[PDB]
A and B are shown apart, each in its own frame.
Chain A
């Protein structure tokens, strides 16, 4: 998260940290959508070029963690993974189309004031909130700049959704309908972007209909971080909800 600010305690109780067991190593962001299911970026678990092809017991996860160096008691939780599910049509060779993945906790987590699930959008909410100009929120423990290095506290930043024509023109990558970009334009006087390490992290919007937070996207890609005329790319969660469904009923 570049040009963002520290997160208030409990402002993102669905924040999940994807850890690598040996060696201990922070890999990506992730989100809690249930007491047993966690959402993240497919390239966080599978990306051959970077020697990434993790399995259930290679990784572990942490929930409700507030700082990155001190273990916080009966606040944070450490859960193992029972299974991993990557979208069968995830295109890691080309444009990261369908950069999404699901993880089932080996043992459900108890909700608390620091740990709760984020909502997944429905037809109405999706079409109602995913509109250029509207601002969403991205969170993460990733780099503060292009490599301070990384934060000791969860970072947050609100960014506006950008119109497809503009996103398409900003990158030489084949943009698909399964993704959207967000960020300020050089003429808006405001900065902020996700960055390396933030992948898997959620892009959430607050619904005025019921006062609840909905995860509209997943941090997926970008070129550099917070560079003028550039935008971060996020997996469009709703267009892939049928798949999330199949995977979950199937499990």
Chain B
């Protein structure tokens, strides 16, 4: 991920960010996630 904040000021997790334990962490996609992905594929 790479950092912007200083842990002592900021806390923890600038690095455990953005990864759902019940989804990404378990390699499981959520029910509408794909819609976002597919929006990255222009007007195909």
Chain A residues in the interface with B (C-beta under 8 A)? 5, 8-11, 13, 33-37, 108, 111-114, 116-120, 122, 133-137, 156, 158, 160, 205-208, 210-214, 241, 245, 248-249, 251
Contacts and interface: CB of A to CB of B under 8 A. Distances in A.
Contact of B21 (A10, A118, A135): A10
If over half of B's interface residues share one DSSP class (helix, strand or loop), that class is named, otherwise mixed; here it is loop
Contact of A212 (B1, B6, B35, B36): B1
A134 B35 CA distance: 10
B9 A10 contact: no
Contacts of B16: 111, 116-117
If over half of A's interface residues share one DSSP class (helix, strand or loop), that class is named, otherwise mixed; here it is loop
B1 A37 contact: no
Interface of B: 1-2, 4-6, 9-14, 16-24, 30-33, 35-37, 39-40, 42
Contacts of A8: 22, 30-31
A88 to B, nearest CB: 19
A-B pairs, top 10 by smallest CB distance, nearest first, are A212-B18, A10-B22, A35-B11, A119-B17, A119-B18, A135-B39, A113-B21, A36-B11, A34-B11, A117-B13
A113 B24 CA distance: 11
Given A122-B2, A206-B36, A214 B18 contact: yes
A34 B13 contact: yes
Contact of B12 (A35, A112, A114, A118): A35
Contact of B22 (A37, A113, A122, A156): A113
Given A8-B31, A10-B22, A208 B40 contact: yes
